Amino acid sequence: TTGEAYFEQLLDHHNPEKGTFSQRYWWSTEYWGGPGSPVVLFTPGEVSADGYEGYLTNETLTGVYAQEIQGAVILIEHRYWGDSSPYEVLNAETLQYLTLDQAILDMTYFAETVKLQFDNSTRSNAQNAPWVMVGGSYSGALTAWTESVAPGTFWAYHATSAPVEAIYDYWQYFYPIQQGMAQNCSKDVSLVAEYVDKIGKNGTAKEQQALKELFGLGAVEHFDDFAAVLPNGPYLWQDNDFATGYSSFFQFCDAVEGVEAGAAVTPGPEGVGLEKALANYANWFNSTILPDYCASYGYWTDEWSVACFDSYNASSPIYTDTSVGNAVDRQWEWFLCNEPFFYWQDGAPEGTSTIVPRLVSASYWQRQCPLYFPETNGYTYGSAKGKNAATVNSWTGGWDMTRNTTRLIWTNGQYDPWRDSGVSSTFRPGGPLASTANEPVQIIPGGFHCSDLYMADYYANEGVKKVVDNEVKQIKEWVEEYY
Numbered sequence: 001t002t003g004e005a006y007f008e009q010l011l012d013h014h015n016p017e018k019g020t021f022s023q024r025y026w027w028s029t030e031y032w033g034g035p036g037s038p039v040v041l042f043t044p045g046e047v048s049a050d051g052y053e054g055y056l057t058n059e060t061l062t063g064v065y066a067q068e069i070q071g072a073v074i075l076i077e078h079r080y081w082g083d084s085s086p087y088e089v090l091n092a093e094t095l096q097y098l099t100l101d102q103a104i105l106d107m108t109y110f111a112e113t114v115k116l117q118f119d120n121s122t123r124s125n126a127q128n129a130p131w132v133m134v135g136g137s138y139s140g141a142l143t144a145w146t147e148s149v150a151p152g153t154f155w156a157y158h159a160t161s162a163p164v165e166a167i168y169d170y171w172q173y174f175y176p177i178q179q180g181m182a183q184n185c186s187k188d189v190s191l192v193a194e195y196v197d198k199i200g201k202n203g204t205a206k207e208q209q210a211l212k213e214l215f216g217l218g219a220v221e222h223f224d225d226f227a228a229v230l231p232n233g234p235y236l237w238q239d240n241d242f243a244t245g246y247s248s249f250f251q252f253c254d255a256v257e258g259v260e261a262g263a264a265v266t267p268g269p270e271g272v273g274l275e276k277a278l279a280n281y282a283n284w285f286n287s288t289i290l291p292d293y294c295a296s297y298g299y300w301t302d303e304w305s306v307a308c309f310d311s312y313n314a315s316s317p318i319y320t321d322t323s324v325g326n327a328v329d330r331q332w333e334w335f336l337c338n339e340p341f342f343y344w345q346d347g348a349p350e351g352t353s354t355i356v357p358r359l360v361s362a363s364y365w366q367r368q369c370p371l372y373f374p375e376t377n378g379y380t381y382g383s384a385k386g387k388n389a390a391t392v393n394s395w396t397g398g399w400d401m402t403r404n405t406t407r408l409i410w411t412n413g414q415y416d417p418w419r420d421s422g423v424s425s426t427f428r429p430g431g432p433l434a435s436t437a438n439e440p441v442q443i444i445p446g447g448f449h450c451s452d453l454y455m456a457d458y459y460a461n462e463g464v465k466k467v468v469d470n471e472v473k474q475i476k477e478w479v480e481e482y483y
């Protein structure tokens with residue numbers, strides 16, 4: 001049996017008397033064992049909960065967990081998304097309560113205090129029953145940070161592809177993509193990305209314009225903004241999966257190496273060279289990607305519109321649409337500018353090879369925060385009041401929260417673009433966290449973003465199956481310890 005309910009969440013957990021707001025949540029007792037049985041808690045994170053109904057199911061890791069431990073599952077919508085915002089206009093004033101501190105106490109308070117329709121008794125709240133927090137991507141960092149910051153409510157935690165370390169200049173976002181990408185495609189995307197830099201730095205107004213026209217982006221005023229489209233190639237890697245097959249990422253690397261989908265003859269490890277890779281890249285963007293791009297924000301109808309790419313128009317609707325269901329996910333942008341997480345997705349520093357133009361820099365992204373959030377009735381975003389990535393790592397422990405852990409399990413993906421801000425990062429001091437009995441961690445060979453949350457991956461790849469079986473076994477053994 002299933003249901004949808006509303007929980008009256010505290011607006012300010014340190015001031016419970018500024019009042020409440022309504023937060024949307026769903027539950028299934030499909031595998032529930034009755035009072036005192038476990039509860040598996042999940043939030044989609046930085047997104048409306050519309051369409052996430054599958055996480056109540058054993059087609060996702062969350063239900064698989066519930067089936068094996070005979071618990072219920074509850075999907076909770078994160079504050080400020082979907083039907084769970086305390087305000088209908090999101091600016092620097094109203095967004096003041098969208099904070100990691102508040103999100104964390106949101107879950108512990110919910111688990112400790114919600115009056116569940118399938119159990120009016122207190123006997124399945126977190127004080128009298130084991131609650132398992134599961135999350136991937138930011139929700140995984142939320143799971144882990146709750147273990148770090150408010151340890152005593154949930155019984156166990158599983159965090160997959162969690163970016164627990166806040167990083168300002170996060171060029172390492174593209175490092176795993178470089179590694180897992182084909183060699184020829186890696187070298188050739190490096191060539192094009194470094195050419196865009198040389199034209200933007202040491203190049204003429206005429207050279208710059210010509211280059212921007214190869215992509216069909218001649219009307220883009222700022223060269224900055226043109227360089228920011230090129231990761232559209234590497235970005236597709238995050239849409240990968242062990243069941244996506246011949247996916248859009250691989251279609252892009254074929255376009256760059258000048259071949260058709262099932263070609264008999266292909267380039268070797270060294271690729272096709274700059275003059276050829278430049279044209280294929282440029283033609284791939286103008287042909288497949290650019291059409292209807294801006295139109296997918298709903299703010300423009302023109303199929304060949306080029307306005308979405310203008311990050312300097314302070315009046316663009318990507319900045320001024322303050323509605324809860326805006327298109328750019330400004331709520332997530334607030335965490336980046338205010339917490340501050342940053343995670344700015346940039347080209348590598350000068351010593352280091354890059355598949356993204358170095359023009360796409362931390363400053364490029366930082367600049368956009370006051371346009372997303374102009375100063376409102378005295379309030380700003382935190383990185384303008386002096387906060388930085390150490391503001392968060394000081395509090396959460398970042399990478400080093402692994403030092404004292406209890407009943408928390410990590411999964412990461414070998415080629416996950418969010419790997420290098422998580423616990424298995426190659427840049428973390430000492431290298432990837434070593435697995436221990438007390439604190440297990442495993443890396444999915446060849447893995448992408450949260451590639452163990454969909455069961456389609458379980459059947460499609462024998463590596464995921466090993467990882468899914470071990471962690472399901474660890475969550476079972478740990479919950480049994482509650483009795």
Ligand SMILES: *[C@@H]1O[C@H](CO)[C@@H](O[C@@H]2O[C@H](CO)[C@@H](O[C@@H]3O[C@H](CO[C@H]4O[C@H](CO[C@H]5O[C@H](CO)[C@@H](O)[C@H](O)[C@@H]5O)[C@@H](O)[C@H](O[C@H]5O[C@H](CO)[C@@H](O)[C@H](O[C@H]6O[C@H](CO)[C@@H](O)[C@H](O)[C@@H]6O)[C@@H]5O)[C@@H]4O)[C@@H](O)[C@H](O[C@H]4O[C@H](CO)[C@@H](O)[C@H](O)[C@@H]4O[C@H]4O[C@H](CO)[C@@H](O)[C@H](O)[C@@H]4O[C@H]4O[C@H](CO)[C@@H](O)[C@H](O)[C@@H]4O)[C@@H]3O)[C@H](O)[C@H]2NC(C)=O)[C@H](O)[C@H]1NC(C)=O
Binds near residue numbers: 182461
């Ligand atoms: C130099 O540059 C080259 C050009 O870019 C580059 O080649 C490209 O490499 C990438 C990465 O290796 C290839 O992507 C893979 O493609 C696999 C499918 O290949 C078949 O389809 C391709 C697409 O073409 C389509 O074309 C038409 C379209 O209508 C149709 O034919 C159909 O749609 C085709 O699919 C073909 O390109 C490909 O061609 C092979 O066979 C041809 C003869 O028929 C031959 O001409 C081809 O030549 C190439 O290779 C040979 C060497 O063998 C070389 O001599 C040639 O010159 C040329 O290089 C080629 O042999 C096929 O017909 C995908 O399976 C694969 O995706 C898997 O992996 C990723 C990443 O992990 C996952 O996202 C996917 O989900 C998927 O995972 C599944 O499969 C893997 C298997 O490894 C498992 O690990 C997973 O667990 C999962 O398994 C599950 O699903 C499977 C079914 O999907 C089940 O089997 C399994 O049991 C599980 O259930 C990836 O997309 C890309 O195709 C290729 N491009 C070309 C043109 O070749 C070079 O790498 C590069 N070299 C260097 C050194 O840098």
Ligand SMILES: *[C@@H]1O[C@H](CO)[C@@H](O[C@@H]2O[C@H](CO)[C@@H](O)[C@H](O)[C@H]2NC(C)=O)[C@H](O)[C@H]1NC(C)=O
Binds near residue numbers: 030
């Ligand atoms: C996932 O859960 C479904 C139920 O939601 C399981 O299907 C049930 O299986 C039992 C035993 O085989 C049957 O008695 C039920 O009639 C099935 N229910 C439905 C709705 O089909 C399914 O077996 C589970 N999958 C796995 C891999 O364990």
Ligand SMILES: *[C@@H]1O[C@H](CO)[C@@H](O[C@@H]2O[C@H](CO)[C@@H](O)[C@H](O)[C@H]2NC(C)=O)[C@H](O)[C@H]1NC(C)=O
Binds near residue numbers: 151404405
């Ligand atoms: C690891 O962290 C846990 C959680 O913060 C610590 O457990 C606390 O220990 C103090 C002192 O004994 C108690 O007053 C608290 O009630 C405990 N809280 C919980 C939630 O268990 C634990 O001491 C830490 N372990 C190490 C080795 O530092």
Ligand SMILES: *[C@@H]1O[C@H](CO)[C@@H](O[C@@H]2O[C@H](CO)[C@@H](O)[C@H](O)[C@H]2NC(C)=O)[C@H](O)[C@H]1NC(C)=O
Binds near residue numbers: 313314
């Ligand atoms: C910045 O964005 C605003 C809003 O999208 C643009 O203003 C619109 O311009 C179109 C034609 O370009 C008019 O049809 C609309 O009526 C305008 N609406 C508003 C609210 O201004 C503005 O042109 C953009 N600025 C630049 C330099 O491109």
